[PDB]
Structure 1
Amino acid sequence: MKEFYLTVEQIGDSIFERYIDSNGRERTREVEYKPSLFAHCPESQATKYFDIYGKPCTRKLFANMRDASQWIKRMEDIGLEALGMDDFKLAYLSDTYNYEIKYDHTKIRVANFDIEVTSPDGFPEPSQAKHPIDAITHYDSIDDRFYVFDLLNSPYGNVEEWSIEIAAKLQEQGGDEVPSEIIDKIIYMPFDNEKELLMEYLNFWQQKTPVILTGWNVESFAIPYVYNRIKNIFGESTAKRLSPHRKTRVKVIENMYGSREIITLFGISVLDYIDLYKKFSFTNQPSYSLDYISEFELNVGKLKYDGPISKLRESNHQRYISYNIIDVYRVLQIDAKRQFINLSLDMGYYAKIQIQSVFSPIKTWDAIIFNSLKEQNKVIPQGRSHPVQPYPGAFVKEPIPNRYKYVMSFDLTSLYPSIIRQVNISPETIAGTFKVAPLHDYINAVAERPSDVYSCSPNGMMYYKDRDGVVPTEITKWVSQRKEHKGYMLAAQRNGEIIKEALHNPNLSVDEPLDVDYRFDFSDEIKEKIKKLSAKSLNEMLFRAQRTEVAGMTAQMALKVTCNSLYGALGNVWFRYYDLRNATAITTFGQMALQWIERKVNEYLNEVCGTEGEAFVLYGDTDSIYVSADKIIDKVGESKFRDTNHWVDFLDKFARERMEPAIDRGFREMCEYMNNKQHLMFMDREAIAGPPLGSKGIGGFWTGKKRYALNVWDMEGTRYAEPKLKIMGLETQKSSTPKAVQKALKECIRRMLQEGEESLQEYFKEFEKEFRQLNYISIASVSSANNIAKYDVGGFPGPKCPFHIRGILTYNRAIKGNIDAPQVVEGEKVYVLPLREGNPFGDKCIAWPSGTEITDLIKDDVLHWMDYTVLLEKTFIKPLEGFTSAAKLDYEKKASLFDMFDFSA
């Protein structure tokens, strides 16, 4: 019964809105919106509207939006503030939906599709639409159907109708392996000519017009192509038929490098899935092709085909259509796992914004704050212009590069939101300034107490303790959501370790997986049924537990990033509530908060162990402390632990029963010293790390800031079945490191931390012997391809040319003149290999598009001229020199006086 918007659009002096009504049906309005803006007035003008600072405001109701828009600019030319929401879409949604929006996703039409274009000329540039669209697959979320639009006749070949019978069959049988779940859901429709195809597609589009349009590179390729191909054949107005309100606009996106053109479809919220992935996955990938992401996410990968893609419709039109269908389903499987579309809806309806505006945290928070203020009858300050200006951030401790045997970590929960809430930081809560002492003076508690009446930050800023703060109040509503979804995440993880422990000694009875909610710890009853369960049904349970973890991971990470984005926006010049005094007040409090508790943890552990002046905190970054636990184990004497798990149990209790209350009273004292509104500095225990008992193995090491590795047994409550490596910053964790090298360097680390020096040297030798045998794609570096043109000097490398860019210019030379081989695209990623002296190619390296094999017309030469020695040293040895140097180990056995004896037994 409760209605909600789908899309909202401003065109001239009218608001074009698509919504779902009281009876759950999709309809369209054209409301001539009467917008309101505000202005300062004298105190003898008692009204109900006030600005955030308390100053009285008068309401200005306009006839049209153009009038309101042109009132603003002739209020600036006099120098008078023009308060209010100037984005009239946000104003409308706030007016039309003055309540908590609850929505039904089954009545929201989500569509994803993909185009096929045979192009011998090369890449079919979406701006020119030079070649016929020979295939479209369109999935509708309301119908649950894959609509295939196949072209049988082009100037590139006449082809037979595609068979759903053949598509269903196994590749071994001669079939295509289109998943069985989507076989009954395909609507096939063949077409004799391109015009007909395109014609019915539009009719289909009008009847089933997308609310959300998604897919892989839809904004970048699909939409612009179908728009321009229709435009060039039928005319502008027919191409306008892609928009419900018949309005399209070419948008120019220009970054620090070049510029690209996309097309707005007024009345459709386009969420290109690749863009959801880059924003919400929190994984930098070597490639962003759908095949690559699919294999990473789902462990499937696509079936192969003979020859280049431009010859595929010719030779095998059957597979040609099947692949286009699979590709569309891939995105749906990825979303079924990651849930990025659900996330974007939950966010956009909560913020009361255009769904696409989820990509903009600034737009998001400006609407959240406006809507929170509007409820109190308050008026938002005008967006001012500001010069970009630097300001300070977090503290990071300079660790001593060494091995560290027993380590335990602690970390502040929602640091910046918690700081905002503790200090009551907000644009309207500012109280004034106090004279500041050097940051060190506060850390040791030797500076004078800043205030008795106000809440302070060591940057000199003051805040009201009694008043409620707008930023603190709204961000609170977000923090509790994160704790909920993180709780589910950890529980699914804890449940996974129980299951993995049951996989060690499994039964073999023909049974089914237990139906349970993985978001919650298993009861004693369920535990026992698991201990007597089959591997088949255990593997399914595990897969489902990990799917819940990922769903929880994604949920809470987005809630984390959006929260910290509010802080970030405080340091952004375009944010309505930009204020460096606030942004700095947050970060300086963090610096003090860490170093403060470092001192406190150092004091407590000294007294407790019976020593004085010993540094226990070895490292910290922003809001963490890494505690050396060696003295805590040594005082007991590890000779009193029966197994590894025994000493893990000891440290966990020591943390929870002894260190945490000592930390809690530490922060409590700091909350007093600053005179804050409320104590919110809570530190969760994270890692318990160390070598397996009675083994060689260094447990962990640090090379420098942001670079360390630990052998974790327990992470934040989860007690693993087998120890897991925590590696931060090291090459194993960078998308630029070759796939095989990441794998090898990790094994080196695993041996260092779990097994010791002899084990490491053993593996170094064997890897060094087998290196030359590895897949060339597995041993290639990855890098982004920015500013190719800048360094392109007539085909050759220019001054200051980066290694990977040189690689591209070499590639471009070797593929030249040949009609089409895969070109390298600006701003995208490339594989890079070194080449030995005197090769048939120009320079010393070669690069080519990532996630793909190089053209067969240049491959053999590359493989033959690879510089394995250079590649091994640069990517493997040099990084391993770093880890072993820091850990005070040798990866290679050093000359000894023992070398003069004969050992053969």
Structure 2
Amino acid sequence: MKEFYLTVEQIGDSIFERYIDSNGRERTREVEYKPSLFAHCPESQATKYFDIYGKPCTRKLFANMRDASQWIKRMEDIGLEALGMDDFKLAYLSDTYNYEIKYDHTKIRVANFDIEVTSPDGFPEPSQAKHPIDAITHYDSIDDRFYVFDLLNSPYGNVEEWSIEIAAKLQEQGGDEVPSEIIDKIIYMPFDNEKELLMEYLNFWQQKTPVILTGWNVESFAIPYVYNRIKNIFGESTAKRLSPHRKTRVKVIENMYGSREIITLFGISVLDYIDLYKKFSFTNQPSYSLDYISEFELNVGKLKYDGPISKLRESNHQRYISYNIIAVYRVLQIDAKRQFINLSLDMGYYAKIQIQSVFSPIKTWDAIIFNSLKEQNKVIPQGRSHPVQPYPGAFVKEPIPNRYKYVMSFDLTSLYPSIIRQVNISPETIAGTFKVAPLHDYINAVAERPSDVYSCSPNGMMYYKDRDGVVPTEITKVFNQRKEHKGYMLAAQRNGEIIKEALHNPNLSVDEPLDVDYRFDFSDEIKEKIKKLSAKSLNEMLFRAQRTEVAGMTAQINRKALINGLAGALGNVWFRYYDLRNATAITTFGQMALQWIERKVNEYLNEVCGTEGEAFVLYGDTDSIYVSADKIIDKVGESKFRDTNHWVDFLDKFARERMEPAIDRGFREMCEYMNNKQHLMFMDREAIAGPPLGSKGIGGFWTGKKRYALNVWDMEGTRYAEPKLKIMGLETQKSSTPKAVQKALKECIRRMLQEGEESLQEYFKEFEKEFRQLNYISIASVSSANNIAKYDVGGFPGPKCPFHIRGILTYNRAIKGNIDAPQVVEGEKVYVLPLREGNPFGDKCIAWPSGTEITDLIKDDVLHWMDYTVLLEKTFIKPLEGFTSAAKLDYEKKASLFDMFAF
């Protein structure tokens, strides 16, 4: 076995490292690491160390890390650059693991835990920890066991032991329905008192010390609550046993409004799953409660109980403990699906950072680039201070609002990273500048050629062509990984569609799902076998295919996110390689590329159609073009196609055989114009969109920038069994839009695009008539709630008070005095409802914590005073009015001369 680190820390002049040794065993060591830093030196001094610009450096080897840090300070005092890796544990990892790390996840202890705390007087604050911890469930990935620590005796009630037998039984049997597959994995430990529970928990923790520590809100709640509670009962030294090195730090996390505390446990890598989910899922959710996310991710029912959670232990200890166990399992279930832990480990070990640093793209890239440059004995520059300066980004074309019947789209592959590679944009590759013409002049190829020597961006920057910069080199490596995983994702997607087709004609038989790798396109043999399978086996295969697609999505999109993160890091003042010249070189080239190719595609299609000056490109955003294909379809004639799939094939062939070579010629010319190092502008066909053949559907529409809908039949080579709606920006896509309203607006759009005006009018009429029956939560708007205190003029709305904040203030007055009433949390999200005039709440709206039922203290009055009319107009009618006017449709049948009863 090749060795790999688990955790690394600097504590004074020592590195503390936990690691897996050559025999696969977990060990810990203290190393008195002597760091090196660098200073510029005269050419007269023979050296093997050079900075990124090729200037010679002397290496200074320090007696200890404190000496090195002090030297950095004195160098600032003198006014001289202190070069090298100033984060010493990153240098330590680089020296200790001077190879591509291969890690074995089976040896890494991943701990998932959740605690329960009964509190009669509101939310139990982690920084006070004034209430007993009465349950802990702690899952250990190495043991594959759920360790349950259950407090039987508390000042808030004495209870009986939890029953695994009742826990396993169905809810319909009066049981808790703890999943059958974890029942035999539960190790249950009841405790007479809290001191014994906590002492035993620490002994357990010492035996099975987490490397990766996760759960739901563990960083903001569970960890600080456990640490502070132990601290309160036993003292500080005992609480610090949560750290393998007995070192902890209270860390103050600042935001805009804006501060909270966490506990850093040295020698542990905390990856709170809520934060992993927020970074890696690419969702924006109305609520981030575990119940909400679990329901969204797994389609599992909410954990049902009677009364408040503050009385659950006393009234139903059995359910209390079962739900604590289930809470831990649901995070495991989400991860088995999303694979964010696996992703974090992959990224972390690739970069050679503390695993928790994956949350920082700057730290991630700083380490990758340092390791790369170190291999060539090059020396990284010192991070400098920079004022924050705004800079220009992408071009977005203003579309003409309209219906668009036949649409084909194209999108540049990893644009920004591709620009970096093509132009060779890097700190050490800057060759100089050239005199800029207006962007329009480059777009139209009338400007003077920037350089005959160097590779250029239209922002005025020139780059060397003799060798690749470190940024192009390293971005290429991660890009290639992304490309591989996207390949697996798309194959699984295509494979899913094959299964969906078979599900139309399932064989009536008893059989098993096929053992197949869904990351690769099914062979003919597999395809034949699939057509002979039962619906039960096919649905299981579909589930597996979709789980494979999810796994591939996680791996690809977040590698895409990482490489795009490097382009953005160049525009962040804290990045070691911050340079607005390089950040703007990328964005400005991107603007030119889009508009260059818009002109080229327009010219090509005008030529092939035998027309002049017509706009075929209807829209573009950053690196995409949307092309009107009406004229292409019309040249062969609607009536010449057998079915929808026939014209989809035609457009697919047209894109591949005609348009793609034209796009490529256009970009090859642009590459020569800018004298770039390597042509890397690859613009794959994305969507083929249109109405079903023979229908009255409109196919698509745009209302404005970043606001459109398309009926897609093929997306990047995935031919759908059923057409899929691609809706961007519209209210159906916004977490702020009520759930039921998203659903209704989506159906209106479906009818518009697939069936036509009449079908849309029928549905509108029905929804308008029935909507007052919808559950209040389904028709509540959602909003983040920041700056509640600012607009609070005890306790009424101050000047310019936002609508949702007014709602919260209404809520606060209506629950005033109640210690048990759920409190709106600053920075979190609320449901919002309008209130009818003359209501007992004294204002026009009310808001309460999102993902929850409004407290029974006021529920009936809210339900009675809900303004359904205002609700409908604001969330449904107004957006729909926007869709239909853009599409030139009416959602209500206009009067005609035919209106003499007989239609």
Same fold (TM over 0.5): yes
Q: Please tell me whether the aligned partners of residues 836 and 865 of structure 1 are also in contact (alpha carbons under 8 angstroms).
A: yes
Task: Give the secondary-structure state (helix, strand or coil) at the position aligned to 1:69.
Answer: helix
Distance 2:508 2:299 in 1: 26
Query: Following superposition of structure 1 onto structure 2, how do residues 745-824 of structure 1 map, counting pairs within 5 Å?
Result: 745-824=745-824
Distance 1:86 1:420 in 2: 27
Q: Please tell me whether the aligned partners of residues 291 and 303 of structure 2 are also in contact (alpha carbons under 8 angstroms).
A: no
Report the counterpart of residue 726 of structure 1 in structure 2: 726
1:161-216 CA-partner distances (Å, limit 9, x unpaired): 11111111111112110011111100001101111111101110111110011000
Distance 1:895 1:787 in 2: 49
1:803-838 CA-partner distances (Å, limit 9, x unpaired): 001100110110111231110101101100000001
Runs of 4+ residues over 6 Å off in structure 1: none
Report the counterpart of residue 587 of structure 1 in structure 2: 587
Distance 1:709 1:48 in 2: 59
Distance 1:842 1:141 in 2: 53
Report the counterpart of residue 865 of structure 1 in structure 2: 865
1:628-678 CA-partner distances (Å, limit 9, x unpaired): 000001111111001110000000000001100111111011111111111
Task: Give the secondary-structure state (helix, strand or coil) at the position aligned to 1:505.
Answer: coil
Distance 1:46 1:661 in 2: 53
Task: Give the secondary-structure state (helix, strand or coil) at the position aligned to 1:77.
Answer: helix
Distance 2:199 2:444 in 1: 75
Shift of 1:282: 0.4
Distance 1:243 1:734 in 2: 42
Q: Please tell me whether the aligned partners of residues 33 and 92 of structure 1 are also in contact (alpha carbons under 8 angstroms).
A: yes
Task: Give the secondary-structure state (helix, strand or coil) at the position aligned to 1:172.
Answer: helix
Distance 1:391 1:128 in 2: 44
Shift of 1:311: 1.0
Greater shift, 885-894 or 354-363, is seen at 885-894
Shift of 1:246: 0.5
Report the counterpart of residue 667 of structure 1 in structure 2: 667
Report the counterpart of residue 291 of structure 2 in structure 1: 291
Q: Please tell me whether the aligned partners of residues 738 and 779 of structure 1 are also in contact (alpha carbons under 8 angstroms).
A: yes
Shift of 1:345: 0.3
Shift of 1:896: 2.4
Task: Give the secondary-structure state (helix, strand or coil) at the position aligned to 2:127.
Answer: coil
Q: Please tell me whether the aligned partners of residues 269 and 356 of structure 1 are also in contact (alpha carbons under 8 angstroms).
A: yes
Q: TM-score of the superposition, structure 2-length normalised?
A: 0.99
Shift of 1:901: 4.6
Distance 2:901 2:167 in 1: 68
Q: Please tell me whether the aligned partners of residues 454 and 464 of structure 2 are also in contact (alpha carbons under 8 angstroms).
A: yes
Task: Give the secondary-structure state (helix, strand or coil) at the position aligned to 1:560.
Answer: helix
Distance 1:254 1:599 in 2: 47
Q: Please tell me whether the aligned partners of residues 40 and 55 of structure 1 are also in contact (alpha carbons under 8 angstroms).
A: yes
Task: Give the secondary-structure state (helix, strand or coil) at the position aligned to 2:816.
Answer: coil
Q: Please tell me whether the aligned partners of residues 424 and 455 of structure 1 are also in contact (alpha carbons under 8 angstroms).
A: yes
Task: Give the secondary-structure state (helix, strand or coil) at the position aligned to 2:425.
Answer: coil
Distance 1:303 1:137 in 2: 16
Task: Give the secondary-structure state (helix, strand or coil) at the position aligned to 2:213.
Answer: strand
Distance 2:781 2:132 in 1: 37
Distance 1:592 1:174 in 2: 66
Q: Please tell me whether the aligned partners of residues 137 and 146 of structure 1 are also in contact (alpha carbons under 8 angstroms).
A: yes
Distance 1:621 1:367 in 2: 32
1:468-500 CA-partner distances (Å, limit 9, x unpaired): 210000000011111111111111111111111
Q: Please tell me whether the aligned partners of residues 18 and 267 of structure 1 are also in contact (alpha carbons under 8 angstroms).
A: yes
1:297-335 CA-partner distances (Å, limit 9, x unpaired): 000023311111111111111011000000000000000
Q: Please tell me whether the aligned partners of residues 836 and 844 of structure 1 are also in contact (alpha carbons under 8 angstroms).
A: yes
Greater shift, 458-467 or 275-284, is seen at 458-467
Shift of 1:150: 0.3
Shift of 1:530: 1.1
Distance 2:266 2:478 in 1: 31
Unaligned runs of 5+ in 2: none
Shift of 1:857: 1.3
Shift of 1:620: 0.2
Q: Please tell me whether the aligned partners of residues 737 and 781 of structure 2 are also in contact (alpha carbons under 8 angstroms).
A: yes
Task: Give the secondary-structure state (helix, strand or coil) at the position aligned to 1:678.
Answer: coil
Q: Please tell me whether the aligned partners of residues 725 and 750 of structure 2 are also in contact (alpha carbons under 8 angstroms).
A: yes
The answer to whether the aligner puts 1:680 opposite 2:680 as a matched pair is yes
Task: Give the secondary-structure state (helix, strand or coil) at the position aligned to 1:777.
Answer: helix
Distance 1:770 1:547 in 2: 37
Task: Give the secondary-structure state (helix, strand or coil) at the position aligned to 1:38.
Answer: strand
Task: Give the secondary-structure state (helix, strand or coil) at the position aligned to 1:854.
Answer: coil
1:122-177 CA-partner distances (Å, limit 9, x unpaired): 11000111111110000001100000000111111111111111111111112110
Distance 1:901 1:813 in 2: 55
Task: Give the secondary-structure state (helix, strand or coil) at the position aligned to 2:599.
Answer: helix
Distance 1:335 1:540 in 2: 19
Distance 1:225 1:695 in 2: 61
Shift of 1:614: 1.0
Task: Give the secondary-structure state (helix, strand or coil) at the position aligned to 1:303.
Answer: coil
Task: Give the secondary-structure state (helix, strand or coil) at the position aligned to 1:115.
Answer: strand
Distance 1:830 1:617 in 2: 41
Task: Give the secondary-structure state (helix, strand or coil) at the position aligned to 2:428.
Answer: coil
Shift of 1:897: 2.8
Task: Give the secondary-structure state (helix, strand or coil) at the position aligned to 2:776.
Answer: coil
Q: Please tell me whether the aligned partners of residues 292 and 301 of structure 1 are also in contact (alpha carbons under 8 angstroms).
A: no
Shift of 1:506: 1.1
Distance 1:505 1:5 in 2: 53
Distance 2:58 2:301 in 1: 62
Shift of 1:353: 0.2
Q: Pairwise CA RMSD of aligned residues?
A: 0.8
Q: Please tell me whether the aligned partners of residues 408 and 628 of structure 1 are also in contact (alpha carbons under 8 angstroms).
A: yes
1:674-722 CA-partner distances (Å, limit 9, x unpaired): 1111110001100000000111011000000000000000000000000
Distance 1:46 1:397 in 2: 56
Distance 2:793 2:270 in 1: 38
Task: Give the secondary-structure state (helix, strand or coil) at the position aligned to 1:428.
Answer: helix
Distance 2:485 2:38 in 1: 40
Shift of 1:28: 1.1
The answer to whether the aligner puts 1:430 opposite 2:422 as a matched pair is no
Shift of 1:755: 0.5
Distance 1:806 1:897 in 2: 49
Shift of 1:900: 4.6
Q: Please tell me whether the aligned partners of residues 815 and 821 of structure 1 are also in contact (alpha carbons under 8 angstroms).
A: yes
Shift of 1:902: 4.8
1:321-375 CA-partner distances (Å, limit 9, x unpaired): 0000000000000000000001000000000000000000000000000000000
Task: Give the secondary-structure state (helix, strand or coil) at the position aligned to 2:251.
Answer: strand
Task: Give the secondary-structure state (helix, strand or coil) at the position aligned to 1:544.
Answer: helix
Task: Give the secondary-structure state (helix, strand or coil) at the position aligned to 1:474.
Answer: helix
1:376-409 CA-partner distances (Å, limit 9, x unpaired): 0000011000000011010010000000000000
Shift of 1:842: 2.3
Task: Give the secondary-structure state (helix, strand or coil) at the position aligned to 1:899.
Answer: coil
Q: Please tell me whether the aligned partners of residues 782 and 831 of structure 2 are also in contact (alpha carbons under 8 angstroms).
A: yes
1:727-773 CA-partner distances (Å, limit 9, x unpaired): 00000000000000000000000000000100000000000011000
- State the identity %: 99
Distance 1:669 1:818 in 2: 71
Distance 1:880 1:468 in 2: 51
Distance 1:678 1:242 in 2: 52
Q: Please tell me whether the aligned partners of residues 112 and 138 of structure 1 are also in contact (alpha carbons under 8 angstroms).
A: yes
Task: Give the secondary-structure state (helix, strand or coil) at the position aligned to 2:631.
Answer: helix
Distance 1:468 1:687 in 2: 34
Q: TM-score of the superposition, structure 1-length normalised?
A: 0.99
Task: Give the secondary-structure state (helix, strand or coil) at the position aligned to 2:173.
Answer: coil
Shift of 1:898: 2.9
Task: Give the secondary-structure state (helix, strand or coil) at the position aligned to 2:58.
Answer: strand
Q: Please tell me whether the aligned partners of residues 454 and 464 of structure 1 are also in contact (alpha carbons under 8 angstroms).
A: yes
Distance 1:206 1:19 in 2: 16
Shift of 1:775: 0.6
Task: Give the secondary-structure state (helix, strand or coil) at the position aligned to 2:427.
Answer: coil
Distance 1:727 1:658 in 2: 27
Task: Give the secondary-structure state (helix, strand or coil) at the position aligned to 1:692.
Answer: coil
Shift of 1:23: 1.0
Shift of 1:62: 0.6
Distance 1:594 1:70 in 2: 50
Shift of 1:505: 1.4
Count residues in correspondence. Answer: 903
Task: Give the secondary-structure state (helix, strand or coil) at the position aligned to 2:184.
Answer: coil
Shift of 1:508: 1.4
Shift of 1:899: 3.0
